[PDB]
Design a protein around this nucleic acid. Sequence first.
RNA 1: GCGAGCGUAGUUCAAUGGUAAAACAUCUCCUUGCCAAGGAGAAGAUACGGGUUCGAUUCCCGCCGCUCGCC
Length: 941
Amino acid sequence: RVLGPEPWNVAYVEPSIRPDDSRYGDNPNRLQRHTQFQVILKPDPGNSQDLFLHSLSALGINVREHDIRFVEDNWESPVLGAWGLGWEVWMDGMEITQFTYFQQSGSLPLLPVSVEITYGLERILMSLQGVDHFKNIQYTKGITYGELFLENEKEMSAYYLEHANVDNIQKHFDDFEEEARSLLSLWLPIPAYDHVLKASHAFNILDSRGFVGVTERARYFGRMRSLARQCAQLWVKTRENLGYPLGTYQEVVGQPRAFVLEIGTEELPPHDVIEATKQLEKSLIQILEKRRLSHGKVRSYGTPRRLAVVVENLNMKQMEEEIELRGPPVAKAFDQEGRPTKAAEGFCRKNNVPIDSLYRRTDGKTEYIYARVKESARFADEVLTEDLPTIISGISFPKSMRWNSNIVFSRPIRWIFALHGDLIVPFCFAGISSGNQSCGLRNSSLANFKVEAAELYLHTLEKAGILIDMQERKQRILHDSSILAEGVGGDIIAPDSLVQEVINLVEAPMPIIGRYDVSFLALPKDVLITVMQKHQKYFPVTSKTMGNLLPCFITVANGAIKEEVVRKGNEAVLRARYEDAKFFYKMDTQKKLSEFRDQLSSILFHERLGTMLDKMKRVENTVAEVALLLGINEKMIPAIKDAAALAMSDLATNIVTEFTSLAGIMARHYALRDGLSEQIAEALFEITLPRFSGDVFPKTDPGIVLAVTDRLDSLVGLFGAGCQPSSTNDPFGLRRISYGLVQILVENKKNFDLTKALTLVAEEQPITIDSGVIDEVVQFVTRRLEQLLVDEGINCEIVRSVLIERANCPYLASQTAIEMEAFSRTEDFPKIVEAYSRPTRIIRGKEIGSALEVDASVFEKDEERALWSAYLEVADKIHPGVDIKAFADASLELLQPLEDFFTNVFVMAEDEKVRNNRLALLTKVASLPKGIADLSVLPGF
RNA sequence: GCGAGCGUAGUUCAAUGGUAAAACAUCUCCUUGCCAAGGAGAAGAUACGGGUUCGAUUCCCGCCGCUCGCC
């Protein structure tokens, strides 16, 4: 009932049962059956998030005292085929509610869009009551929540988890599927959807029991997606054959003054402020001067809910000067006794100057009749009315919404404040008429004010608390955090990829210190800081003497905050996330690390080639040779192989399934603790480097072998088994995987062979690899090397004349392409590029049959006896792997006997048989540079 | 999967509302001949389709290819 034109304001309460989250009722947060509260509003009323905050203080919360935050989180579900954009609501660190605008459902777009608010009533009641474990929540006066739902939590888990008969469910799945597919032919949507409901249930208690393998999930999701995809198209029609019984949705001259334009919004993401406070100022800078208007210091600003721009002392009229303008040539328009044909009139009509006010000028060919024009001063406030809406509509985001019309933006626009001097610039955009009002800090005494003159805008804004200048929020975060961190004895850890995302989550910052327990310090350091940074957005604190962690953290509130309830509320969320990660860790140190391999066989890699255990199986059997292609020392080929079986073992651990960014850290941590060598453990970490664009590369010796051998397999397998990247679409990430393999080499001084390693790591795969499909992987790698090499300030014509035969070993190519440009800029390049061109053109094909023929059989020539000597004494130096400088000094002395041979000897055949000496003697001199550079492409030939 | 930027002789690049320029390559004519080099001349392009305007390579829409970020 969100599909159609039908208005549907409704709100209900329902439990929700998901069995794979059943944990016998012991961990205080996860339940197999939890109550929700759902409210859907269609159409969107407009107050849709000022009714929410009345709801909160209705259920007894003090919203001027706690810290309510709208942190963005999109929503998508492919099974139903729906998605939407919106936020989640953090009260004092706890995520309590989701808030979404819908845009797809089934597979047909929505009109009008719906608003979905979904409270979760057991994560709210533990916070509002000071309780850590759900079985202490007071249900009513006298009875507890545990004493009602505990054994249902306890023994429905044993059913969904161990004793669920798993074939009388595999049959019921297909039975329900068939019945729902049949009742979609008598045109009955209601039961034909209830059967989809009770089939997608029976799939969950299959998945929980583990009976679903790894390759059946892609089939089950498909089987059940096209049932919801085609119940929708039946419902939306059976509605309209009734006639929609619930209505239908249809719809002056003076000195210069400043000019300020703000576009209020609802909370934008943290990185849609940065890429939208630029393509607005640029798009304004252009159009201010395109229309002949002069100004001064233009300056942008940003906040999660406004995007302001200020242009100072803007003009009051256009510049109003007369400019020349030339039109069509005298050939097209002008003619003898036929001057106005069809073009002269079109050239004067759009300019309305009289037709006898034209003259001629030597415009190249003394043509292009023309005249003058006027600029038409237009008061600088009726100009902007025409050009602002196309400014504001210009900004473009990757993800975008619709709320009440077909206009698209990233979040709904709520107010527009655009003024100039004292007067308002009047226009309208997306149903909002511009004015001079603005909302300050929400839920304050200045939640609505009006600014009179545009020169006291900023001074009024920061009179309501807001700090809009983005670069003066960083300096009030990182400078009131230091006093706190030094009051306890330490200092903060602020990677500037976290400050750029803490700045744009706040409007008027306020920092607070908090304490967590000391007995959590036994965890690894890089799980503490990852909990405190990548999920909660806190600041850790490290004692600057003996620089390890302390039991403190720093959090950033927003506004007029009680700062006695928010510290106490934040201290008790990462007393729970730590308390879960500690249980996971203690469950992971129960077994030696070498046993976590045999769980790997339940992670999919690719369908027709398999899991991850087989892939890591196909690497121990080849990492004993890629250490010979790289020329690794002999006394380390043992110490690599035992660190190759343990590789990628931590990917089945309990932690790494929860914190999927610690793949690689929590393998070295276990390995060192188990009692391996140091270099084994350190190599167990760089099988993952680099993880993205711009990360450290493997430096140790056994760290390169594995990081190369993995990237060879994930290339040859994915290529020779269907998934080729031939598209703009990038599945399986075949671009960065191929890009990193050349950086691990050019950054590490290694000599490799791309056409021998790919003839040996393809031999192993399960599917057959023919010699033709590895000749495209070499090209897909060489193009990536060329792109890496061009954008280092290199010239484009030399990197295509070294990559013809030095393209195999990616280090020597990147070595000899930088060393060739510096030689190309010196004044010996035109001597050599010609010296080698006189004997490669002259031999464009004359049936040289006797292959070698270089002999003194009959060499009765004069200059031959002095040319072949030079060829031998240079060819004795140039070996197939020499550098470019020995070449560039060994050909300069060969260039002279060339012009002493061509001067006299008549190479072409005046005799019948003996004219092949004179041909081979130049074929050889032409072929010497085969292996160093392909000299027949460079210009100047 | 979505966005962003691009497409001009054979290769590299200037221009813009209305006679699309130059470099290297190609061709012909020269002759201390066949190669090279110095000289004159000639031919050669806006990926494709649609829209307004008198005229679009330029402004608008749609299709094809390429490069790059996220998934």
